[PDB]
Design a binder for this molecule. Structure first.
Ligand code: FMN
Ligand code: FMN
Ligand code: FMN
Lengths: 352, 326, 352
């Protein structure tokens, strides 16, 4: 049917870019393209990557004697480093252990797992990987209110401590099901993508926030006015993202949108940043630019492909270790120091 | 002998600027100049005032049905509106009830009292006026380490819930080292007051400050310096949520409170206008000024489409490159 | 063990870029990569190079009748041209004559030799090459104060006339020892990289400046506030560098950071600039931008690989000759004239 990698092993991650080409060797071409690809000719995916060169880190003298500490807290969860796992569908395309494998890596590492509504694994399978670890549940806005009630109940029953409401549903130049949604779509026509609204409104955000009983992050924000509207509608977090360039084409690199959003949010709610994080330097730059944590996506999936949970763990370990080095060089003892970094504005962009 | 005003009465505050001239009629000349005056020819005091015209508010549509609510919280304490009382010395120059009067107005209103290092009332006198209300103690850095340890113990025993370390006086200027010494021994969150440069904010936080208090002390210290409000955004962007920000120096209107919040302050501190209210009516006069700011802020919230203090933190400001003369 | 080149000969240096590929042919692959490589994917090494195109030289009419003179003075040492040798570890990776070979080229040319704490040559070997020439000693900040006392004593005993305190210790996508540090680390656990603080503080600078009995340059400065802090802590010089892009990744090209630092230093102490100097035009641009001298690194090492001391000398000679031509074209009679040059701001960057 679909011959996903099944090997479990640690990997020596020197950088995350090479994981893409390495994964291409073990992942079936179709599944690999699904994971790696983006809208149009990928210009906005390239923009997500090149945006990091727009603001450059300065090395700075230390002001504290202690060894660097990457730990932080979000929504009262203490986590080992300022990154969490982004919600990503169909991990089975990368590895036979699928979302259970990712959840194991995330829980063992000591951060938060985001569960896609479109998970290929059952929650029971994921739960076994999580082994008590914190988890957030990502949902789409259903056209049918009953389906929103259903998924919100599922999330709470599954011990979710936040909801991630993704603003965009579903663009470029599927071997298994989705048990988590099928659980409540069975016997309805919707269970036989189109069940969700293509785009959410402030009214949608207000409905989910009122009925979730959990803090709601609105994911896919790129414009500061949307951030303000979302918070006024009852969002408890803003998740700055263009979903790894998988949706709107010929849009800005995600990092370029972050400061304007952070300035408008002005501490009202936590900010999660994603779309293009590949290096420890990127984590630091996002924090310096107003994010509280970043979310990791494709690199963790490529690690999963290459080594199951241990491969995914290796990627998380890479980010933590690289971040520590960046902290040393920038004179930062802790995650809060990173939030205070001055960045060099590079008007020349990528080619310098 | 000094004949300070002694009457206690509410006053109809239409604007705070007029309180200065009105207070000049009742406060002895020497004391009044001490309160109203600033360094040099007062150009930086004027700059504190004119800076508010550099960033202008937009009227905007509402997105919530509820009436405005000015309440906020700082360091876990719920307060009626996003402003506190600044530490000011020698309130007896303004009114016979001195700091007890101001403390009464502040506690009756429902916000935080800052107690100056150079208060003319005893703690017992101030405590009576506070009636259990929250208070923060402002200190200068003593050259003697034991005097610092003693003042910090005294503050904590007197029920202080924060320490305000004023950067400019005692040592005439503080260093990161000084901040570290105070933060390490206080048992309370320490605000560093008098910050105008973002690198100082970063150094202070790294040295152990639990808050940054953006201030030029109402233009009473360095002359030919920027208006305090112009320094706020750069500091806020560098602090980047690490610790709460108190802003002061020039707040005269509800619009100023809104603009400070939109620019990264958590609360502002009020100074001269409250003292002028005290001169004019004792605690009830000072209360009248706090009430004015609360009511004026409520109007500004309505007009900007803001239901609560958080909405204020999200406002967009119009950049006015023309400055005061437009 | 390690088959370093040993031939001694002059080389016809047409440009320094070609010396890299030429050296790659004679230097063992491992040692060559150590010398040539930089952090991440080398984007910041490329930035060091491309930064030179951000400020362009104007040809200008002459105002003096005399022939150009490249001589200058720093810390009262008169030197033949406004460049010195940067401190670089393990010259034996390039050539069997190692640091003695470099020191000979530098001393014969008539400039200052910087001695890395991580030299592969003994001081006695280096001294023979130096033959009385001026030398500065580069140190790292030891965690153990005794080790700092030791190296400061070594430097003075070796006739050093300045200390170079490198701010960063030890990042990318060793056949011999270090006799200079082993001399005082022997019998301690440290002698059996981790002995130094990862990053220095102003307090560290103050300690070294108070106990050195010599002017102390703080090396690795890229931010003006660090320059001010370093000077207030007792530094007698600022050495603007990102260590040839070998430390912090996704940082600015070193030359782009120089004017802001020079403006803050405001003549208080001399400035040494390095990281990417490849041409006489670069020396001129650095001087026009506030440096007193530049330091040369990789090109001198590649020359050493290709021809021992005579090869290294050829590179120094190339820079002096090329600088002279630049002086003629810019209407400059002397090094001071270079400090007064107007540069053309190029907002387009490298691709123009
Ligand atoms: C294979 C793939 C599937 C994804 N599925 C979802 C999804 O189910 N829900 C969602 O909110 N985001 C989804 N995302 C977007 C991610 O949450 C995240 O925003 C993105 O991976 C970040 O970009 P990066 O991985 O390039 O750094 C997916 C991304 C990819 C790579
Ligand atoms: C009369 C006078 C006395 C002051 N005394 C102190 C003091 O004891 N300690 C201190 O930190 N600030 C002191 N300040 C500064 C205030 O805390 C505050 O920063 C200032 O009043 C704000 O400016 P504004 O009142 O013009 O808005 C004083 C200010 C004035 C007006
Ligand atoms: C092979 C290599 C080893 C180095 N070792 C040291 C070192 O021991 N101490 C130090 O302060 N800098 C060291 N550096 C950095 C240099 O002092 C200098 O900053 C750098 O070579 C300048 O960049 P460029 O050679 O590309 O022009 C080293 C650089 C390289 C190329």
């Amino acid at each position: 049917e679909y011959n996903a990698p099944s090997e479990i092993k640690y990997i020596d991650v020197v950088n995350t870019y090479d994981l893409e080409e390495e994964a291409s060797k073990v992942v079936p071409h179709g599944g690999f393209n699904y994971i790696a690809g983006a809208s149009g000719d990928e210009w906005t995916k390239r923009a997500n990557d090149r945006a990091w060169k727009h603001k450059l880190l300065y090395p700075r003298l230390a002001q504290d004697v202690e060894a660097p500490d990457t730990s932080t807290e979000i929504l009262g969860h203490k986590i080992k480093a300022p990154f969490i796992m982004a919600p990503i569908a169909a991990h089975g395309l990368a590895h036979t252990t699928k979302e259970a494998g990712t959840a194991r890596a995330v829980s063992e590492f000591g951060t938060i797992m985001s569960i896609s509504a479109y998970s290929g694994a059952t929650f029971e399978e994921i739960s076994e990987g999580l082994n008590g670890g914190p988890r957030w549940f990502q949902i789409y806005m259903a056209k049918d209110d009953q389906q929103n009630r259903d998924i919100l109940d599922e999330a709470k029953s599954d011990g979710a401590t936040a909801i991630i409401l993704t603003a965009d549903s579903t663009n470029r130049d599927y071997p298994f099901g989705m048990p988590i949604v099928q659980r409540y779509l069975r016997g309805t026509a919707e269970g036989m993508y189109g069940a969700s609204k293509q785009k959410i409104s402030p009214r949608d955000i207000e409905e989910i926030a009122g009925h979730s009983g959990l803090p709601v992050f609105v994911k896919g924000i790129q414009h500061p006015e949307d951030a303000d509207m979302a918070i006024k509608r009852g969002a408890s977090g803003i998740w700055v993202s263009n979903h790894g360039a998988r949706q709107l084409y010929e849009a800005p690199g995600s990092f370029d949108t972050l400061p304007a959003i952070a300035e408008r949010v002005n501490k009202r709610v936590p900010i999660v940043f994603d779309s293009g994080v590949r290096r420890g330097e990127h984590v630091a730059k996002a924090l310096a630019s107003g994010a509280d944590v970043v979310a990791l996506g494709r690199p963790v999936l490529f690690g999963l492909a290459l080594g199951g949970w241990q491969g995914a763990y290796s990627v998380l370990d890479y980010f933590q270790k690289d971040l520590t080095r960046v902290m040393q060089l920038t004179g930062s003892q802790n995650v809060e120091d990173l939030k205070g970094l001055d960045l060099f504005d590079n008007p020349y962009g990528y080619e310098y």
